[PDB]
């Protein structure tokens, strides 16, 4: 894993220093190389621990002259890769081009090594174990290290540009994946300069992503504006303001089932939610949200609110009747029970309840057919994970629909205890209305601040809170086991002691003090300790830390809501029919440009 | 102490100005020195108040010509130290080298004073009274003042480097203790340049610290990185990333009973918790914590949680029986008493309680044998002081174990009132579960946030709060001494008035308002004053004060938890057996480097 690389690197260094040829290639001592290399006793074809040649060692430590002597000693020697597990296809050309040694690449290609060497090594993988992902080809290595002249020399000697390595990446896919994008613009332009006849910008991965879509997924906004310098047309400039015409061929993506915007808004990266703020995308999703996204989202919110008002008033009236058996036990105070299904629906008002039951079952099943293909369309961690797609809202919507269908099963089969899934369904369903709060600037950042504090501060407070409740509830229950439960009914046995200590943590119920009887002194001492620790400190320390993280996380949740309205926009027009959602953008067929469906913006630059 | 130095300095200045020779050496008047010292009536061997020579006075005020004039008049004055209490061995060479007077040191060593002068004076001590700790030798003075050429002159005239003063420090120990580390790197290299055959880097103090260990203790991260430049080996570089090989001979410290990391994490200094974030230490303690520290810490947390669930369960079920005597006193609610040991264990369920009581007794004694050698291993203020080592958690763990054994003594000897050590043991034991919250990023900084508010803001609020409770409880008790206790049972006598005013401070219990009777008006007036002052202002000012403290202290508790996980890691593998904890790092014996047990890192610098 991580110590296997350490072990194989130490074996590599040990096999370098044990061999005289490999250590002499490392040390760049030319005369001792001449002494051991003029004799025929030494073996030119000699492996290291990773299967490396001594030429790989000489290219590893920037030894130009040692590489020239082992090249003139054997001209076949450059055409040999390492053949062990970390470097399955690494050649001396790859090591020579990663170090940006021009004369070594010149002499090594003069000897005639393959430029199409395809290194299927574990170190050259897109993995968290590896520090870089520079490629599996020498041209990908040359572009990712940032050298123009070595790229031109590699194109001059073979090395076709359309070379797809593992995970489907070409060199244009993998220029975007690198950081430090200052020199990557000119490298992208240089590699598009030799692309002269399908184009190279449209080849997909094994994931299926376009380099445009890979720039959208990875959040590389510098490559995104570099791609939109070449996908825009400036219509006119009139003094301080200009009008220009962007192309929505690759952003809107009509014919493709996996659109660009869905791959942007459902990425695992911390960025790519700031690429929605860029000049082609911001105006498009603003027009798409204000023209159609906000009115259909508001009428969907109103329909869901009216449906769950109907479900709530369908919960308020229930088939409840008087208990047939009288109560023979004190402390038992139930007077009504759930009546049977044979006596449930006989009146007109029970028929008005029954049609509301049919409405809420129909609503639950159309929720399930809306959501379960969305569960199966993406990953399960991809659907329930991000708050951008409303993942916690998705799982409570799924839980609410399953609890309503469980209530349907319990009603028809006449099982008692319907109040427990009805109350769970009421809480989770009315908290599912909070999903529709993202469409408003007033309610959206507030709602995701609530969910992000639920994930961050609420759990970390509730662990230590449950620690304090467990300890002080154990003390409160063992202070009154010797005492009368009829004077203080709280802390009578351990579950109500735990619940009572939980309520006195939050200062909800009153402090237990029956002043007409003699309470224990140790209850006063440990209640003073509980009041200093829990009520005085822990609640106010919770307020202090959540304000302290509120002022830090406020900007992040503002831009998170700004990405969330885009995710809400592109969640629609996939589920809704296309006669509700016309194709956004100015159509180019009416003006003779060839059905590319452009979008015009006007900006004031002076 | 501090005014004794003022007194001896004023006596020194008075004895300078009273003597004509000392004042003439101070004033640098050469001619008046020639008339006074050409005559034989004056005394060359003449003391000040601190036993100083007039040559010491001439060296004190950078008087070169006067000092050389007393050299040519009397050459024996250079070989003479001050012999009084603040300067027991200070010579003219020490004063000459602290002022960086090169020609004065040249002339004074040309006359032949000792370079091995060893000043056992109170001013040259590592003490808070003294401003600097420059040494007790002239070469330590030359190193700490930062002059290369006087160091080379002192090596040129005697003055071996291996000279240990009081506290066992050599020169390389004492370069690290100085601030302003810009010039101390080249001074360190210059003093290692003449170290050519045990090495000078390995001589300890009287405390036993290595200079590497002294840099680890003092938090001198500049000297730490300078030392790790010279104990590392760069294995290779390949383009943007390089792999290098640090040595863990002095960091891991196998054979030594006082390890480097324990001396780092258990220091009194505010820094050296930032020296754990350096390049060889961060990867080592991260591998040590993720590979072994987190799983055994999690299973220790689970074992402690299950043990104290067992202890809580043995607390809930107790040998309790009905009272033999009936209640002849109202306000008394005691219905049960704890039964005798002869009748305590006769059922099956009492045997299940008894085996769990044996489990918690053996748990308490293995807590005591784990903790009491850790109390005796370090200082008692060292063990219970820092929150890095979990000192408050250590003292509440000690108190919990002693209370459980006290409960064992009270159970066997049948003393009443077991609810007092059982309730304190339950509260302190379940709050000792918070010690295991430091192993998680979600719970650790929150837990030490709680302890830092307990030490800082809770005590400073509770002093002023207990002042308000005392005053308003005195007012509330003297507003209702003339009134009926049966209508308001609170404020009946003074302890329940104090407790009731304590609860009304925290807004836990309701405001005392019996609306069916005529309450006094002055209770309403002083309750309005109490509600404005305590409930409205003081509680919310406590919220505001810990918010204002939290935004300043959040970064400090982040790095405090980052040091705390290292202290948790190195607390383990000393207590746990070595078959649970293998030796961390890449072993050098398998690769022929001489069992130095290195550690390899790979870093991306470009």
Cα separation, B279 vs A198, in Å, equals 49
Domain locations in chain B?
A: 1-278+584-606, 279-583
Cα separation values, B485 from A516, A517, B98, B482, B503, Å: 9, 12, 80, 9, 18
Cα separation, B192 vs B227, in Å, equals 11
**If we measure between CA atoms, which residue out of B86, B71, B15 comes closest to residue B48?**
B15
End-to-end Cα distance, chain A: 56
Q: Which two tokens stand for residue A353?
A: 């309840």
Number of residues that make up chain A: 606
Q: Identify the experimental approach.
A: cryo-EM
Cα separation, A260 vs B354, in Å, equals 68
A75 part of contact set with chain B, CB < 8 Å: no
Choose among B442, B539, B554: nearest Cβ to A548. Answer: B554
Residues of A in contact with B462 (CB under 8 A): 532
Cα separation, B350 vs B355, in Å, equals 9
B454 part of contact set with chain A, CB < 8 Å: yes
- Indicate if the alpha-carbon torsion angle A474, A479, A485, A489 is positive or negative: negative
Establish whether B510 is an annotated binding residue.
yes
**Axis crossing angle, helix B30-38 with helix B20-27, rounded to the nearest 10:** 150
Contacts of B373 (CB under 8 A, 6+ apart): none
| CB neighbourhood size of A329 (10 A) | 6
Residues of B in contact with A531 (CB under 8 A): 502-503, 506, 508
Cβ within 8 Å of A, B 550-579:
550-551, 554
Helix and strand totals (H; E) in chain A: 25, 5
Q: Would you call A544 and B546 a contact, using CB atoms and an 8 Å cutoff?
A: yes
* Exposure class string for A298-326: b at 16+ Cβ within 10 A, else e: eeebeebeebbebbeebbeebbeeeeeee
Cβ within 8 Å of A, B 403-442:
419-420, 422-424, 426-427, 429-431, 433-434, 437, 442
A461 part of contact set with chain B, CB < 8 Å: yes
Helix, coil or strand: residue A233: strand
- Indicate if the alpha-carbon torsion angle B107, B174, B254, B592 is positive or negative: negative
Task: Write the DSSP string, B198-233.
Answer: --GGG---SS---HHHHHHHHT-HHHHHHHHHTTEE
* Exposure class string for B482-516: b at 16+ Cβ within 10 A, else e: ebeeeebbbbbeeebbbbbbbbbbbbbbeebeeee
Contacts of B268 (CB under 8 A, 6+ apart): B382, B385
**If we measure between CA atoms, which residue out of B71, B80, B70, B139 comes closest to residue B111?**
B71
Whether the CB-CB separation of B88 and B120 falls below 8 Å is answered with: yes
Cβ within 8 Å of B, A 509-528:
510-511, 513, 515-518, 520, 522, 524, 526, 528
Helix and strand totals (H; E) in chain B: 25, 5
**Quick one: closest CA in B to A549, which residue?**
B551
Residues of A in contact with B316 (CB under 8 A): 474, 477-478, 494
Residues of A in contact with B449 (CB under 8 A): 541, 545
Breaks (C-N over 2.5 A) in chain B follow: 197
State which H helix or E strand residue A504 sits in. Answer: helix A494-505
B312 part of contact set with chain A, CB < 8 Å: yes
| CB neighbourhood size of B286 (10 A) | 14
Choose among A9, A483, A540: nearest Cβ to B546. Answer: A540
**Quick one: closest CA in B to A7, which residue?**
B586
Residues of B in contact with A2 (CB under 8 A): 287
Diameter over CA atoms, chain B: 111
Cα separation, B468 vs A113, in Å, equals 88
**Quick one: closest CA in B to A493, which residue?**
B316
State which H helix or E strand residue B599 sits in. Answer: strand B598-604
B489 part of contact set with chain A, CB < 8 Å: yes
Q: What angle do CA B532, B535, B540 make, to 5 degrees?
A: 105
Choose among B238, B437, B549: nearest Cβ to A464. Answer: B437
Whether the CB-CB separation of B127 and B92 falls below 8 Å is answered with: no
Residues of A in contact with B424 (CB under 8 A): 526
Cα separation, A43 vs B137, in Å, equals 61
Contacts of A107 (CB under 8 A, 6+ apart): A67, A68, A71
Cα separation, B356 vs B407, in Å, equals 14
**If we measure between CA atoms, which residue out of A205, A93, A207 comes closest to residue A154?**
A93
Whether the CB-CB separation of A49 and A86 falls below 8 Å is answered with: no
Q: How many CA atoms lie within 13 A of B67 on its CB side?
A: 27
**If we measure between CA atoms, which residue out of A475, A478, A457 comes closest to residue A467?**
A475
Compute the radius of gyration of chain B from its Cα atoms.
Answer: 35
* Exposure class string for A401-429: b at 16+ Cβ within 10 A, else e: bbbbbbbbebbeeeeeebeebbebbbebb
Whether the CB-CB separation of B265 and B567 falls below 8 Å is answered with: yes
Which residues, listed in sequence order, are joined to residue A600 by a DSSP beta bridge? A245
**If we measure between CA atoms, which residue out of B448, B296, B432, B438 comes closest to residue B367?**
B432
Residues of B in contact with A483 (CB under 8 A): 333-336
B594 part of contact set with chain A, CB < 8 Å: no
**Axis crossing angle, helix A64-73 with helix A20-27, rounded to the nearest 10:** 140
Task: State the resolution, in angstroms.
Answer: 2.8
| CB neighbourhood size of B211 (10 A) | 26
Q: Which two tokens stand for residue B260?
A: 């480097």
Cα separation, A448 vs A112, in Å, equals 60
Cα separation, B370 vs B364, in Å, equals 10
Cβ within 8 Å of B, A 343-402:
none
| CB neighbourhood size of A102 (10 A) | 14
Q: What angle do CA A280, A285, A291 make, to 5 degrees?
A: 130
Cα separation, B282 vs B290, in Å, equals 12
Tokens 């057996």 found at: B577
Cα separation values, A102 from A71, A141, A153, A429, B415, Å: 16, 14, 9, 66, 90
Q: What dihedral do alpha carbons A104, A106, A112, A116 form, nearest 10°?
A: 90
Helix, coil or strand: residue B337: strand
CA distance B358 to chain A (A): 20
Cα separation, A11 vs B431, in Å, equals 50
Q: How many CB pairs under 8 A join A and B?
A: 191
Instruction: Specify the pairing of strand B232-238 against strand A598-604.
Output: unpaired
Helix, coil or strand: residue A230: coil
Q: Would you call B333 and A511 a contact, using CB atoms and an 8 Å cutoff?
A: no
Breaks (C-N over 2.5 A) in chain A follow: 197
Whether the CB-CB separation of B565 and B273 falls below 8 Å is answered with: no
Is A42 buried (19+), middle (13-18) or exposed (0-12) by CB count in 10 A? middle
Tokens 């837990």 found at: B447
Cα separation, B511 vs B500, in Å, equals 10
Residues of A in contact with B287 (CB under 8 A): 2
Q: What is the DSSP letter of B166?
A: G
**Axis crossing angle, helix A30-38 with helix A20-27, rounded to the nearest 10:** 150
Is B185 buried (19+), middle (13-18) or exposed (0-12) by CB count in 10 A? middle
Is B459 buried (19+), middle (13-18) or exposed (0-12) by CB count in 10 A? exposed
Helix, coil or strand: residue A246: strand
Mutation choice for A interface testing from B419, B534, B601 by most A CBs within 10 A:
B419
Alpha helices in B326-418 (DSSP H): 349-377, 380-385, 391-412
Task: Write the DSSP string, A505-528.
Answer: HTT-SPP---TTS---HHHHHHHH
**If we measure between CA atoms, which residue out of B121, B167, B176 comes closest to residue B144?**
B176
Contacts of B60 (CB under 8 A, 6+ apart): B26, B95, B99
Q: Which two tokens stand for residue B491?
A: 């404020």
Cα separation, A328 vs A486, in Å, equals 20
Distance of alpha carbon A260 from the chain centroid: 16
């Amino acid at each position: 894993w991580e110590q296997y690389r350490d072990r194989v690197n130490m074996l590599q260094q040990e096999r370098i220093r044990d061999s005289p040829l490999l250590q002499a290639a490392k040390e760049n001592d030319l005369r001792l190389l001449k002494i051991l290399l003029l004799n025929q006793s030494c073996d030119f074809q000699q492996r290291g621990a990773v299967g490396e040649t001594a030429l790989h060692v000489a290219a590893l430590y920037d030894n130009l002259e040692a590489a020239t002597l082992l090249m003139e000693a054997a001209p076949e020697l450059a055409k040999e890769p390492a053949l062990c597990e970390p470097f399955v296809g690494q050649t001396a050309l790859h090591i020579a081009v990663m170090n940006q040694n021009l004369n070594l690449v010149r002499a090594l290609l003069a000897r005639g090594a393959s430029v199409s060497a395809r290194a299927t090594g574990a170190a050259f993988r897109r993995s968290p174990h590896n520090l870089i992902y520079y490629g599996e080809h020498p041209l990908s290595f040359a572009a990712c290290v940032g050298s123009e002249e070595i790229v031109r020399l590699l194109i001059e000697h073979g090395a076709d540009i359309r070379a797809q390595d593992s995970l489907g990446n070409t060199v244009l896919h993998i220029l975007i994946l690198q950081p430090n994008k200052t020199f990557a613009c000119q490298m992208y332009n240089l590699l598009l300069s030799y692309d002269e006849h399908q184009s190279l910008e449209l080849v997909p991965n094994h994931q299926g992503l376009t380099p445009f879509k890979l720039a959208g997924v990875e959040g590389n906004t510098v490559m995104f504006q570099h791609l939109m310098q070449k996908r825009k047309h400036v219509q006119w400039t009139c003094g301080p303001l200009t009008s220009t015409l962007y192309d929505l061929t690759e952003i809107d993506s009509w014919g493709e089932e996996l659109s660009f915007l869905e791959l942007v808004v459902s990425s695992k990266k911390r960025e790519a939610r700031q690429i929605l703020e860029q000049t082609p995308v911001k105006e498009l999703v603003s027009f798409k949200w204000k023209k159609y996204g906000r009115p259909y989202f508001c009428v969907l919110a109103s329909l869901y609110i009216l449906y769950m008002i109907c479900f709530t008033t369908c919960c308020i009236y229930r088939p409840l009747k008087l208990r047939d058996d009288n109560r023979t036990d004190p402390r038992d105070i139930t007077i009504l029970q759930q009546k049977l299904l044979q006596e449930a629906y006989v009146t007109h008002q029970d028929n008005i309840r029954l049609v509301g039951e049919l409405v809420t079952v129909t609503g639950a099943v159309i929720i399930l057919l809306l959501e379960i293909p969305d569960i199966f369309r993406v990953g399960a961690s991809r659907y329930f994970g991000q708050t951008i797609l409303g993942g916690p809202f998705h799982v409570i919507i799924i839980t609410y629909a399953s609890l309503v269908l469980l209530t349907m099963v319990m009603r028809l089969t006449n099982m008692n205890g319907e109040v427990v899934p009805l109350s769970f369904a009421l809480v989770l369903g009315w908290c599912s209305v909070m999903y529709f709060a993202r469409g408003f600037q007033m309610l959206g950042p507030f709602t995701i601040m609530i969910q992000k504090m639920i994930f961050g501060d609420l759990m970390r407070f509730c662990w230590l809170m449950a620690v304090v409740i467990l300890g002080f509830a154990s003390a409160f229950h063992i202070t009154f086991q010797t005492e009368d439960p009829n004077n203080l009914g709280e802390f009578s046995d351990y579950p109500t002691a735990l619940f009572s200590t939980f309520e006195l943590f939050l200062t909800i119920i009153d402090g237990p003090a029956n002043y007409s009887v003699d309470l224990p002194f140790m209850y006063c001492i440990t209640y003073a300790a509980f009041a200093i620790i829990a009520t005085l400190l822990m609640l106010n320390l919770f307020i202090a830390m959540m304000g302290d993280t509120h002022w830090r996380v406020a900007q992040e949740r503002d831009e998170l809501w700004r990405a969330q309205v885009v995710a809400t926009t592109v969640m629609l027009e996939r589920k809704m029919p296309r006669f509700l959602w016309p194709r956004s953008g100015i159509c180019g067929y009416e003006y003779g440009l060839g059905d590319r469906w452009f979008l015009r913006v006007e900006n004031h630059h002076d």
